[PDB]
Design a protein around this ligand. Structure first.
Ligand SMILES: [Zn+2]
Ligand SMILES: [Zn+2]
Lengths: 109, 99, 85, 93, 148, 76, 83, 99, 82, 108, 94
DNA sequence: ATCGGATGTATATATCTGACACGTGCCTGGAGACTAGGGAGTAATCCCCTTGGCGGTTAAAACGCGGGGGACAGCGCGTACGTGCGTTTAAGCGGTGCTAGAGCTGTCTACGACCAATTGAGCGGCCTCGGCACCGGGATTCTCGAT
DNA sequence: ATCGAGAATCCCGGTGCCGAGGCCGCTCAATTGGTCGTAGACAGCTCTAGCACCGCTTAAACGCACGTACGCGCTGTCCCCCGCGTTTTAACCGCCAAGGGGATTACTCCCTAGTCTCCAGGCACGTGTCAGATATATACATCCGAT
């Protein structure tokens, strides 16, 4: 890089790099922290947040809304498959449950 | 002459209505009083933040919803549609909660 | 056989046994000594050093620490010192 | 008063980068903050355990990469690893 | 409380049959404070020696061990210069069934032969390990002019 | 020549010694006037250990010198 | 100011609504007592850890953070309340 | 004329015998070959410490025994004695392994 | 290279495992499902083990890697190290 | 307690206090380790070890054996209400399973 | 010669002799006990560290370890372990 | 087979209110330049342990067949649960009053990190004898077809 | 209700084997002593908000009655695992041979923690405004008795 702009801008990211580095150092995770670890961690966090936010925005638009509410987040997480495994044990507050009814319980033809 | 629905349709309508919404389903004051009673049983003279009560209520509601989902699956597995105490007991035993 | 008068004395307090208990190592103490021993001592057999931590925890909830037969024998044979206690 | 750090500004920036029109409320902001903190803690803990297990004392990039490969499922892990490698390569020059 | 009755009963026990070469008694008004006297064993380089030591009884007895300290000075590997005693039975080997008579008997038994495993002072310990004659001579030259 | 020594108990002890007197004589005086053998007792002056072999005159001990006394106990 | 027999606050319609959200079409008559017992057990388990957390801090009020931490320790992570 | 036991009275003997025993129930070489074949997909020319294979076999047997316990419980709940694939499917669904 | 090794888990092996599990009567379709679930579990463990042994710049999958993977998945194993 | 002895003997323990202290300090748990923590932790570890070992030896003696084997460890762990709860997910290698047959399957 | 590898073998055997004065232990069960000790120690230390960091502290005193023991163990084991540890600390201090 | 109530759900429109989005002062934490020192990269070497291979021998696997017990479908019933309506009730909302206690700040005293010397606790290697494994014999006890 | 014969299991004694508990030599990490920067204990102050009280609604809960549909027990059918005997397959034990690489040690270099100095990024605080919830009034999907 040019070594002239801010650290977050040098790596072409949006999440902070200094804050992540400080959290890694003061978090009692290891005696030493490398110079490239916070950049990688910030990139991973930014990618995951972007994916979840994109899914939530699509869900909100499909529901005729303009503000991401917890219901949209729950729908986006549940309807996906990778994020469902990643967040299997997480309970989103004010989120509800996916709508489904078992086949047997439906009225007879 | 009076019109009434056959038993079963209102249950499906209620299921469809409740799965769509996200509001709380237990009255706030009874739950708060129950939590206070349990805490005072544990330690005397305790004060509760409102957010703590809300978090406890949300966690309990989510856990009960999951337990009822598992119970419904167990009841369906045995060629039935009603949920019975043995279904809840079997679900809890398989989940490892009580062994 | 009748137990000897020498053996029925408590080793710790040298008093007549009251509701005594028998350790797994065949060492007997009166319960007033045993109950006070556990909280702030080595929690073992005093004459023997045999750990009874799991035994004590299991018996305490069952409330079966006291030996019924031994207690009854001395209580019936020599009630006079039991009454004064 | 005492300052309380949060990732709110950065999440807002990402949202505006992805969906220029949609907004986000307070509860979703808190949920995003909790999710980011949880993922950070998970990845950092796994990286620390990996560093300790191999008689090391520093957390380089490869420990973070292997922690990501361990935690996330297939497609998510692959995309995250690619993004992290790209970010590190762009940063080092 | 119970400590008072226990101390009284055991002082009676020591009264009606004191073991040979050992004496003990409470000099202070408090029953906790005690003094004891031991004469030098015949099979030892401490011939003609008399030793006075003090015993402190903690508040709760007998579940906690008592403390014993020699007032006199003796050249022994297990003893300290200030009189602090390093004996196994006191701290990690205390038991409620033990009595003062038994611990004094144990002190005499170790005065017969010092413990080489865990000496209190290392220099005198290694001097003793070096040769028996040097240790015996130095023990004599300390004890005959400190005992009297 | 009066010398002050302060032990771990805060007691100040005045000893009458001589500049040419060896530390062996000082230790004998301490054990006579206090009843503690010299094995565990050594003097500290200016942050330096006073070895028993070397005499006081080599340490340039002056009038009314202040000495520190620390009990050393060995494990076992 | 003690409280006696307060488990009845979780009435029958509340259990019915929770089951309806769960996806149950027909409910027997003995479900409610078992559900109340399960709820009591779960609440006791969570509140024990919450009270321990507030005890260690020499503090007299349980906060949302303590409940969140107790739930996270117990295995059921919660989102949206800080942490 | 030759003595033949009733159907099911020797299966109980097998249950009693195998629950008392502590040895390994799967053969060694087939399991080792299966482990090597599974592993070679991720990376080529791996070499396996024998202790690793032993630990893998122990873990697999423990997991399968637990799964069979749970599926037998489900079969008993369904008012049957035989175990069927739907029982295993329900047990794994409730345990959350496959969702 | 190896192929078609899942058949090494013979029917008597599954039968004995069920007998230890406390099963009195077994249907005829249990074996295929059991083979499938065992294969899935083995893949899940082996992936983590191979990742662990790849991180350490080695070539032999030691038992410690398998123990670490099992502990990570939530199935702590006692006896082979740790 | 009096000084001038091993730290494992001042508190009466058998587990090494010094090794526990070193592991706590160099375990990347916290910047500073208190003096009383290693003693407390070693006491807890020793109590748990003795608690398991006593039941294991009892089972071994009940099985007409004088040498503890993993089967006895499994028997002692699974037969206690609290130890089973503590060691929930742990799989003891070559430990077998507890004998248990459902009452429905028993012959009538 | 290979490098040193540390373990809790001697202390576990000493505890076993203290509990049963006439019973030995096999090597497999010995390794199992060593692994159990390591697991419990790691659990307690990690919980104590997390609890200490949650209160903006920097030291792990006996209070944090005691609270971790209270949280990790069941109802009766926690009480007995707390009693043992308090006894050990009290005896160590004086 | 649908026909027509009759119900509930979905849909178009006014509105106004509190939460979301943006602007601003500033201060605490991030950024930049320089040193030193230890951790890690890299090269060379050992021998431990992993892979490959062959003979036998035998316990385990594969195959086939008779059949008895259990999976499964259909019938009948009567009892528990859904549905709806009138009534008693405690939740829900507003507003106020107050003090227990969370939160922030200044002092400083005692607990804990760092460094050298030292030697004894613990670890690696050997070894031998006793507890455990195996085999042969006999006594004991579930089990089932037939009474 | 049972007797008795075929078969599986448990006790007991004798013999042999290897691994586990004790011993010796030894290298390194725990102990002791001292010094010093700092953290958290403590006293003190502020001011947030959790608790208790009141009064007025009206939404949810409760009890009762009616009907109905389905959970359970019974009967019957059938077919498929179980148990046993016979044959074919490769697992396992033992043995030998080769070499790949895990583990160790020595050397050097450069990456990062630590330090100080400088400054701007975001954090708490304030204010404007419109997204959406609420209410009101139509339009259509859907459920039920019955020809
Ligand atoms: Zn007594
Ligand atoms: Zn005893």
């Amino acid at each position: 890089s040019a070594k002239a702009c801010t650290r977050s801008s040098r790596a072409g990211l949006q999440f902070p790099v200094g804050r992540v580095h400080r959290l890694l150092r003061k978090g009692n995770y290891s005696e030493r922290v490398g110079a490239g670890a916070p950049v990688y961690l910030a990139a991973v966090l930014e990618y995951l947040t972007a994916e979840i936010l994109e899914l939530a925005g699509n869900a909100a638009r499909d529901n005729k809304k303009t503000r991401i509410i917890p219901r949209h987040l729950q729908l986006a997480i549940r309807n996906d498959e990778e994020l469902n495994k990643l967040l299997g044990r997480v309970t989103i507050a004010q989120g509800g449950v996916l709508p489904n009814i078992q086949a047997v319980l439906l009225p007879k033809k | 002459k009076p019109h009434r629905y056959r038993p079963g349709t209102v249950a499906l309508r209620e299921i469809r209505r409740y799965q769509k919404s996200t509001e709380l389903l237990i009255r706030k004051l009874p739950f708060q009083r129950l939590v206070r009673e349990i805490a005072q049983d544990f330690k005397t003279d305790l004060r509760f933040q409102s957010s703590a009560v809300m978090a406890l209520q949300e966690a309990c509601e989510a856990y009960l919803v999951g337990l009822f989902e598992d119970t419904n699956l167990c009841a369906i597995h045995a060629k039935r549609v009603t949920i019975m105490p043995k279904d809840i007991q079997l679900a809890r035993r398989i989940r490892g909660e009580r062994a | 056989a009748i137990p000897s008068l020498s053996e029925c004395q408590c080793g710790i307090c040298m008093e007549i046994l009251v509701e005594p208990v028998t350790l797994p190592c065949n060492h007997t103490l009166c319960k007033p000594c045993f109950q006070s021993t556990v909280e702030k001592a080595s929690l073992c057999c005093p004459f023997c050093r045999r750990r009874v931590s799991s035994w004590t925890r299991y018996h305490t909830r069952r409330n079966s620490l006291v030996n019924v037969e031994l207690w009854t024998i001395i209580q019936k044979h020599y009630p006079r010192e039991c009454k004064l206690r | 008063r005492s300052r309380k750090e949060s990732y709110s500004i950065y999440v807002y920036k990402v949202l505006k980068q992805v969906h220029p029109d949609t907004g986000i409320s307070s509860k979703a902001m808190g949920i995003m903050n909790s999710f980011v903190n949880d993922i950070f803690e998970r990845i950092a803990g796994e990286a620390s355990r990996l560093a300790h297990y191999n008689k090391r004392s520093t957390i380089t990039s490869r420990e973070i990469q292997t922690a990501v490969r361990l935690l996330l499922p297939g497609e998510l892990a692959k995309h995250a690893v690619s993004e992290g490698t790209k970010a590190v390569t762009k940063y080092t020059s | 409380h119970m400590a008072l009755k226990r101390i009284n009963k055991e002082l009676s026990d020591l009264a009606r049959d004191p073991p040979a070469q050992i004496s003990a008694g409470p000099v202070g008004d408090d029953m906790f404070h005690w003094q004891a006297t031991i004469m030098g064993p015949n099979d030892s380089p401490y011939q003609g020696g008399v030793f006075f030591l003090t015993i402190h009884f903690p508040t709760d007895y007998p579940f906690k061990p008592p403390k014993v300290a020699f007032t006199t000075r003796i050249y022994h590997p297990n003893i300290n210069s200030n009189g602090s005693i390093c004996l196994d039975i006191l701290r990690s080997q205390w038991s409620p069934a033990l009595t003062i008579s038994k611990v004094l008997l144990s002190i005499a038994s170790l005065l017969d032969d010092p413990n080489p495993d865990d000496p209190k002072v290392p220099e005198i310990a290694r001097i003793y390990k070096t040769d028996r004659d040097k240790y015996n001579r130095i023990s004599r030259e300390w004890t005959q002019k400190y005992a009297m | 020549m009066q010398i002050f020594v302060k032990t771990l108990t805060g007691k100040t002890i005045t000893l009458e010694v001589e500049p040419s007197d060896t530390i062996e004589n000082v230790k004998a005086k301490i054990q006579d006037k206090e009843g503690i053998p010299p094995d565990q007792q050594r003097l500290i002056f200016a942050g330096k250990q006073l070895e028993d072999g070397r005499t006081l005159s080599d340490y340039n001990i002056q009038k009314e010198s202040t000495l520190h006394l620390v009990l050393r106990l060995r494990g076992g | 100011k003690v409280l006696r027999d307060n488990i009845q606050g979780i009435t029958k319609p509340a259990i019915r609504r929770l089951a309806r959200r769960g996806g149950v079409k027909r409910i027997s008559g003995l479900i409610y007592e078992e559900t109340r017992g399960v709820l009591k057990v779960f609440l006791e388990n969570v509140i024990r850890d919450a009270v321990t957390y507030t005890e260690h801090a020499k503090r007299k009020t349980v906060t949302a953070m303590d409940v969140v931490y107790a739930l996270k320790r117990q295995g059921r992570t919660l989102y949206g309340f800080g942490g």
